[PDB]
Amino acid sequence: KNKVVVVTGVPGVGGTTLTQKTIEKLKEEGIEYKMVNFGTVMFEVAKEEGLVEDRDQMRKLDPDTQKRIQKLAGRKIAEMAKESNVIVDTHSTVKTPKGYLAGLPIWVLEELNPDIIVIVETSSDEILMRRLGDATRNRDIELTSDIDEHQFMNRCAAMAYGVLTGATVKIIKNRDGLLDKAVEELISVLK
Amino acid sequence: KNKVVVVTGVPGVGGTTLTQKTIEKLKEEGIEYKMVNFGTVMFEVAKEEGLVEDRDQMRKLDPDTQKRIQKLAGRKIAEMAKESNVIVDTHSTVKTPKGYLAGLPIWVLEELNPDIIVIVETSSDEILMRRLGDATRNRDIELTSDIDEHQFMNRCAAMAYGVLTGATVKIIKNRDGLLDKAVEELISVLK
Amino acid sequence: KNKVVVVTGVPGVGGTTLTQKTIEKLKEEGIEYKMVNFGTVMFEVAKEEGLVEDRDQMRKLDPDTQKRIQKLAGRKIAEMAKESNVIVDTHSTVKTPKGYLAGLPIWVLEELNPDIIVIVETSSDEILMRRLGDATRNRDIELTSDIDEHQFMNRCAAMAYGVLTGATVKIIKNRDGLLDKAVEELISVLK
Numbered sequence: 421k422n423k424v425v426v427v428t429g430v431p432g433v434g435g436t437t438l439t440q441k442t443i444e445k446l447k448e449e450g451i452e453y454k455m456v457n458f459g460t461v462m463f464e465v466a467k468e469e470g471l472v473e474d475r476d477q478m479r480k481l482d483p484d485t486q487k488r489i490q491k492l493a494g495r496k497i498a499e500m501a502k503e504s505n506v507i508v509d510t511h512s513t514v515k516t517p518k519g520y521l522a523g524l525p526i527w528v529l530e531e532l533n534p535d536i537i538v539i540v541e542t543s544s545d546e547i548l549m550r551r552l553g554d555a556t557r558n559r560d561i562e563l564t565s566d567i568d569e570h571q572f573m574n575r576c577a578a579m580a581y582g583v584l585t586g587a588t589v590k591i592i593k594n595r596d597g598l599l600d601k602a603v604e605e606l607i608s609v610l611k
Numbered sequence: 612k613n614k615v616v617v618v619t620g621v622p623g624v625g626g627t628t629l630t631q632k633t634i635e636k637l638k639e640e641g642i643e644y645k646m647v648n649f650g651t652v653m654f655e656v657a658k659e660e661g662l663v664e665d666r667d668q669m670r671k672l673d674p675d676t677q678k679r680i681q682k683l684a685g686r687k688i689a690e691m692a693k694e695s696n697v698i699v700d701t702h703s704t705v706k707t708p709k710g711y712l713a714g715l716p717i718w719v720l721e722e723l724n725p726d727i728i729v730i731v732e733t734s735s736d737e738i739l740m741r742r743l744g745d746a747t748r749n750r751d752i753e754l755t756s757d758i759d760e761h762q763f764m765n766r767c768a769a770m771a772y773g774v775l776t777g778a779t780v781k782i783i784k785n786r787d788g789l790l791d792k793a794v795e796e797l798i799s800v801l802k
Numbered sequence: 803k804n805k806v807v808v809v810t811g812v813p814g815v816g817g818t819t820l821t822q823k824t825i826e827k828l829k830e831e832g833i834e835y836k837m838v839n840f841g842t843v844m845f846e847v848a849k850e851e852g853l854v855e856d857r858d859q860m861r862k863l864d865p866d867t868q869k870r871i872q873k874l875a876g877r878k879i880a881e882m883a884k885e886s887n888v889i890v891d892t893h894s895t896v897k898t899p900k901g902y903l904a905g906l907p908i909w910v911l912e913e914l915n916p917d918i919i920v921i922v923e924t925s926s927d928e929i930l931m932r933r934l935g936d937a938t939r940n941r942d943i944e945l946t947s948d949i950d951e952h953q954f955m956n957r958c959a960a961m962a963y964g965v966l967t968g969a970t971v972k973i974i975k976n977r978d979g980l981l982d983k984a985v986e987e988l989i990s991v992l993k
């Protein structure tokens with residue numbers, strides 16, 4: 421039976437970066453994890469239906485459309501969990517124009533049944549200055565108070581996940597200049 | 612099917628004023644929502660049983676009585692949602708002497724099945740100053756820190772609602788003098 | 803119908819002390835509550851299976867094994883409530899190296915079905931300083947920001963418990979030198 425790890429964090433905080441660095445560090449110690457980006461799973465579905473051109477248009481779609489593709493992505497990822505350990509790079513909540521949407525509503529949560537939910541955080545300062553540094557995404561320059569609001573709600577959603585499934589909720593700080601301490605923390609967790 | 616929108620906010624933050632101003636501007640365009648204050652539905656029952664004289668006495672009743680009448684109101688409101696779109700002006704949590712009571716415990720939540728949960732917020736400074744200026748109600752002069760504690764727990768309960776049903780959780784600021792921008796935001800969320 | 807009250811709080815905040823003092827002043831009024839420490843119940847099962855020698859080793863055990871023992875301890879505490887009122891001295895979340903673990907995952911929460919969930923809080927300064935004078939544990943000297951992080955997540959979990967069951971969620975300040983005032987408050991809450 422395989423370990424299913426969810427890594428979450430607002431855009432710019434480094435959930436994806438922490439995850440790639442962690443899996444390569446685990447493979448050097450002999451530990452096999454698969455990286456899966458939840459948003460890519462969805463975007464293959466959405467791109468195939470013609471609803472979007474790029475992945476940062478997904479959060480602006482009608483939220484019933486997002487929840488339909490949200491569920492197909494979660495089913496395809498649950499299939500992956502049978503065949504290897506998996507780390508899911510995704511989001512505790514997604515900021516849509518109609519409010520925060522839970523990234524793992526109970527029906528999605530119950531099919532992944534994640535063993536651990538990791539929250540990657542740093543100060544909204546660093547997140548904002550990091551967003552201003554990367555035209556690689558159509559990332560929202562919000563205020564730091566909007567990022568602080570998102571990290572607040574993401575904690576609430578994640579602790580709810582832990583009440584429903586029994587998963588532990590691990591907060592890892594990923595601060596400017598200290599990416600390496602965060603990789604130590606996440607590696608220490610996955611043993 | 613018909614849209615169910617829940618609007619929430621601590622007393623004094625203007626949840627009711629935002630709900631009435633938004634609905635009337637939508638009627639200028641022919642877009643009909645029916646306003647339903649959850650507490651009025653509760654107060655009609657409580658007063659008919661002889662439990663209270665006014666609506667601000669209900670949260671000081673035995674919490675078992677409140678949950679009894681709370682459950683009746685959710686069913687009565689759910690029936691209304693069959694006859695038109697509804698915005699439910701109500702509360703993420705209610706402050707009772709025995710603690711915060713969820714405004715939508717899970718059985719009520721599943722009976723209303725809302726699409727959107729709106730959290731109306733502003734500074735506890737501005738809330739306190741409105742309660743002191745409001746001769747329609749017997750509003751509690753709490754410390755500003757008790758108001759911030761109530762807005763903290765309201766966020767927590769609301770994100771739990773979004774985890775359990777999939778409803779999106781929208782935060783809207785309703786600042787002094789800027790009621791109209793808050794009305795503009797909600798109208799936009801409801802299109 | 804018998805009362806089930808849950809009192810929760812980070813280590814060092816005085817949840818245990820507040821429960822014992824409240825029960826003695828209540829018996830002077832003829833009000834019988836039974837104290838139950840969830841961890842003591844867990845440790846009885848655990849030491850009988852040989853997993854630990856002392857109780858601070860339990861939160862570092864296999865979270866598959868902890869939830870098996872948390873599951874049985876919640877079931878043993880439910881039986882106690884059939885025979886008397888009970889105050890359960892436990893924790894909203896337990897801080898493990900694998901993250902925060904909900905103390906009442908939904909299946910444990912529903913077996914206890916508490917009426918009131920008390921959160922004991924004070925400033926992270928006072929908790930930290932209390933941990934330093936306490937040779938009954940090797941007490942966790944965390945930073946004050948980690949103690950604050952733990953109290954933030956305990957609020958999130960507790961409000962989720964209130965959404966799922968209907969329990970009221972009561973915050974009680976247990977400040978240095980003012981234990982007797984926190985005791986008055988809890989007594990007042992239980993009448």
Ligand SMILES: Nc1ncnc2c1ncn2[C@@H]1O[C@H](COP(=O)(O)O)[C@@H](O)[C@H]1O
Binds near residue numbers: 437600
């Ligand atoms: N600890 C860190 N310190 C500085 N920059 C970082 C850190 N973690 C991530 N970044 C950068 O921040 C941006 C956000 O990356 P991510 O959210 O991982 O896609 C990328 O340009 C990263 O290289």
Ligand SMILES: Nc1ncnc2c1ncn2[C@@H]1O[C@H](COP(=O)(O)O)[C@@H](O)[C@H]1O
Binds near residue numbers: 490
């Ligand atoms: N669990 C999820 N639920 C809903 N939408 C998601 C989820 N994970 C990712 N997304 C969407 O995928 C996009 C790309 O994710 P990311 O690459 O991880 O920033 C996000 O902006 C969201 O629109």
Ligand SMILES: Nc1ncnc2c1ncn2[C@@H]1O[C@H](COP(=O)(O)O)[C@@H](O)[C@H]1O
Binds near residue numbers: 622789
């Ligand atoms: N944006 C605002 N600026 C000033 N006063 C407001 C605002 N929103 C509501 N009020 C007032 O604040 C009080 C709270 O109203 P409500 O909660 O809607 O009953 C009432 O006196 C309102 O008229």
Ligand SMILES: Nc1ncnc2c1ncn2[C@@H]1O[C@H](COP(=O)(O)O)[C@@H](O)[C@H]1O
Binds near residue numbers: 650666
């Ligand atoms: N969802 C709810 N659940 C329980 N009580 C509620 C709810 N909504 C309103 N109430 C009660 O109704 C009273 C008046 O509500 P309001 O006029 O919305 O300030 C509140 O002070 C509460 O006692």
Ligand SMILES: Nc1ncnc2c1ncn2[C@@H]1O[C@H](COP(=O)(O)O)[C@@H](O)[C@H]1O
Binds near residue numbers: 844857861862872905
């Ligand atoms: N609800 C709970 N779920 C899991 N472990 C718990 C729970 N309550 C207590 N424990 C364990 O018991 C230990 C001692 O509890 P306490 O004496 O109340 O601080 C804790 O540090 C946990 O390892």
Ligand SMILES: Nc1ncnc2c1ncn2[C@@H]1O[C@H](COP(=O)(O)O)[C@@H](O)[C@H]1O
Binds near residue numbers: 815818820976977981
């Ligand atoms: N209000 C208070 N003021 C000072 N010390 C307290 C207070 N409440 C509890 N304590 C002490 O704080 C320590 C931790 O409490 P506990 O979590 O019950 O183990 C114990 O030594 C208690 O005696």
Ligand SMILES: [Mg+2]
Binds near residue numbers: 435437509
């Ligand atoms: Mg990413």
Ligand SMILES: [Mg+2]
Binds near residue numbers: 626627628
């Ligand atoms: Mg109102």
Ligand SMILES: [Mg+2]
Binds near residue numbers: 817818891
């Ligand atoms: Mg204790």
